[PDB]
Amino acid sequence: ESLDFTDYASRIIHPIVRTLDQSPELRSTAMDTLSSLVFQLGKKYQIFIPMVNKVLVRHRINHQRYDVLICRIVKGYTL
Amino acid sequence: ISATVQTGFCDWSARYFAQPVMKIPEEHDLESQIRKEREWRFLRNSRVRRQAQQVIQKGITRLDDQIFLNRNPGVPSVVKFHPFTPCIAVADKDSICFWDWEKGEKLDYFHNGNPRYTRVTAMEYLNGQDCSLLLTATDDGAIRVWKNFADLEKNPEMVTAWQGLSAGMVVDWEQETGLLMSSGDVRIVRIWDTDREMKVQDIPTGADSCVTSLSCDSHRSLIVAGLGDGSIRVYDRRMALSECRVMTYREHTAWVVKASLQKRPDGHIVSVSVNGDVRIFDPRMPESVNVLQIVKGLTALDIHPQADLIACGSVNQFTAIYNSSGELINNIKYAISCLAFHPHWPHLAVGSNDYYISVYSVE
């Protein structure tokens, strides 16, 4: 919410994706962290979208806020 | 005031500056897909030239094979073979049927647009080597050019059209020179340059009768022009218009069905009138070298430059295919008003009064 996290996108996103496999309990918290990060990255998150989508389908992760944010990013609307 | 129309010419011209300029054009790109497909077509062309040249060295065998027999709605007036792509345009008085001789299917059907009195006499294939077009000169004078004539995803498209002149009309395309020489009932042989879209030279024929046929020589100026009275003039366009006429030998009295010239440096004008007698002339001689008499009542004739077969016709359904020396090869038993050889393969089309199109082949 307060700091800039663009620099450290890989250092976080890759452990998160890995956390969403190895443990289903953290899946909720981690997805909430991911959506917030996505909101902060914006168009810079476009790179990671293919890989994360792959991990979501593997465990049917259907987050409301995240799907909205991706939809907005692909559309290009800013809010 | 609403009748005042304004062309989009001044606006279309301004589009030149919207497009980029500094960058390399698409044609200069050696690795572009259009150039690769063009180089692939030229690779296919050089193969078809080589393979056809190899068949000529093996001689010409008897030709009796019928690849197909279809029927058109109209009478076949003029036939041409596309040099490389198998597209055999068989035009009619009020249409241009585009047939094929590998699938064996009707590919397209145009309407030329000309009135009922007029008739499409002559036809050519412009830019036959690649991105070919179809010139369609009408007998009254109208010339017009058609693109995308046997395509899957495309329709008829008339590129350009302009009233020429003003027998019917005769044409001799010269791909390398870029010129086009309309002629017919008039006493003039115009030379329309297609790069400048203007008539360059208007050579006077010097003959009362109509110019029934007209054939020229590549890499030289040797405009041969048969005439309805019988004579066969030859003109050189390099000299002055008054001096353009070189020879005027007359040894016939009938319409010249097809005064055809060979592409060799040893040019031989094989002229066959309605009488049906061949007289092989030369451009450098005043009289005929060889003489032949084939059919009494000739109706239409065709020749091939690569193979010297004088494909004759007959009222009694015969198709005499003799040599220039006059030897008998075949007499294929079925107004045969259209025969047409390929520029490369020894294929011979035939077309009787009945609207039936064939395509023969030498095994």
Place this chain on the structure above:
Amino acid sequence: EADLTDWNLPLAFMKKRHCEKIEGSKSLAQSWRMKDRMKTVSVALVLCLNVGVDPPDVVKTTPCARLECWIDPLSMGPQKALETIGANLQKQYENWQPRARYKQSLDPTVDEVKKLCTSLRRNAKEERVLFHYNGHGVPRPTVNGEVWVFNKNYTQYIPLSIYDLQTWMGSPSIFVYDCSNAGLIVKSFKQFALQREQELEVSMKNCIQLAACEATELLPMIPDLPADLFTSCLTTPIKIALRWFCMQKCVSLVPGVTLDLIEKIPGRLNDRRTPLGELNWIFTAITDTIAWNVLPRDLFQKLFRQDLLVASLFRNFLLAERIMRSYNCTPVSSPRLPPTYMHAMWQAWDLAVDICLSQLPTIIEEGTAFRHSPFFAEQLTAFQVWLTMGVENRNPPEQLPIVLQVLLSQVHRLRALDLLGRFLDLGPWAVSLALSVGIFPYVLKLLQSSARELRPLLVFIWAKILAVDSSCQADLVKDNGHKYFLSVLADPYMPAEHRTMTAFILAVIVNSYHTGQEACLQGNLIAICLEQLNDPHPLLRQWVAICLGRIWQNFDSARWCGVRDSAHEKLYSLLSDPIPEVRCAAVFALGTFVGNSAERTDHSTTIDHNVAMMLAQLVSDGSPMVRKELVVALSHLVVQYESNFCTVALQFI
């Protein structure tokens, strides 16, 4: 092999006129034009400094923050200091907007504020008025939407309702609040805005608001920074930007750079060749770049293009947002901006500062010549690298507003004009972008230059622009830029490629525009055009002929000049031109010449019959494109003699 024969063959009837249709491209809705130009006519400086007194709400630390408008109030004594700060503050604002009526209010009453605001509203009823509020000396604003002022005796803090404060000020206005809980004012302002909108059934978008802090946040108490931290940022950005740079951890990278060297930095804020003016110029580019990349195009032109002073305030607001963020402070704006503090361009600003004031020890002490920054050079290098692979419609280049800033000097003007042309070449989408960023009034100002090296570059740039937006013909006549091009068209040494573009530019200015036809006629275009009518370039011959045809389009004066010069006679040569574009252009001009006879003397009729028979010998022509214009040309002849052609038509019936 049999391939050299194939490649060396003319492809007949395969050219632009054949493949593409002869049709004009539909002009897009050019929205780049500014709707209106605002002018900040007057400024209200409400200063509640309360010098010599401390507000009860905030228990100030013993050092606290003393500097106000870069003036220690306790040094000068209470009354003089308050007058001095008001004077300096006016000067500071006069750096950005020197032509505005300033009226200070120093610890004002309520009536005093009422009479002040109502007078400034009377002066500029329809124009923006700035309201500056500095509440460092009064208690923090209340939740009920109130702001504190004094009583006549300065014995009681009187509250002032934001509703009443926004009553006296009008619709077009901008509000700057520099106080502790400044968010409360902005919230309550929008409330009273909504409350007024509810009352209107049975002034929101117009009113802009900037606030130093969020309602919860407090202003920093740090002795190093000035107390007037927000106002200083808005009004002296470079000054605090260097002082803040010297407070960060990044000073270790430049040892021997204290605040004392920053005080004694040489130069001024105007002279861009000095060290101080260099930074100000760089800063203006960087801030305008961040804004264009982050904000949506609509809101950018609203704030950064409408009027200069607002654009300057928001430019400096972005710097305030960055600095105050580092002290748990968040500035607030009424049109909410997305956070720009972490933009990449900010890193470039640090390096630019670092290199600029690493030389200061040698400039002050050794007296070394200040070498200019490579910043603008390197930014053009980045734009050039982008152009190499810029064919695709990818994200636009960040540096586009920097290219604009580079055009203002001469040092890099040649390189920028080149690159800008290459960019416009890419396509009409790019020309639209360059018009939206606001290149037009600067490219037009360069037409006042006399540097002949610029002539080929400006001709190119203007041809691309006028190809898209033909309405700019209005502007070129106003500024007498058509004379600049006339000179290029009468220069034999100028290549025929650039002279061709020049003839097109003139053919657009003249196109269906009587003011431009009358202006180019007086500039002797027809005589100049005929001098170039027999050039060895088929593009020039075509357009020069269209240009000639357009100038006498429904304008008999240009026809008479053509009759004196005898142009119609010289045009018959083009009727036998090889290139059918030229023949067509020739038919166009000869047709437009006939069409505007307007029942002149008999001479005209004999000339029209001479032009008729010369056109009547273009029937047997190969190109139908020419034959089509031949009809349109003979249409003009029929329209002129409609009564005569009716006699011929009725005869053969």
Place this chain on the structure above:
Amino acid sequence: EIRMEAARTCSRLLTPSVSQTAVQVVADVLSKLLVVGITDPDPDIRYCVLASLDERFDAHLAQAENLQALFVALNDQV
């Protein structure tokens, strides 16, 4: 093993690296490659891809979009 080899293959087959179509193709492939080099979970594949982006490609890597990817890569776990 397929991803790791297909990466080595494409990076080798782009040694022929003016035609706009080829540039747009190289730009597309190299954008996909950079995405794999940033986003692939298996850090061996990410290392191979990054190592394969040699001097040859530096004309393309210097583009803004490609440089924004590379910056993220300076904060890799490995």
Place this chain on the structure above:
Amino acid sequence: VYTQIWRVLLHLAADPYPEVSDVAMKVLNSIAYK
């Protein structure tokens, strides 16, 4: 002179190309009804 230019427009009216014949016919018909 007008006889000659009307005969010219007759040639453009009977043009092989459709676009030229169409535009020539419009302009030629806009005379007839006057």
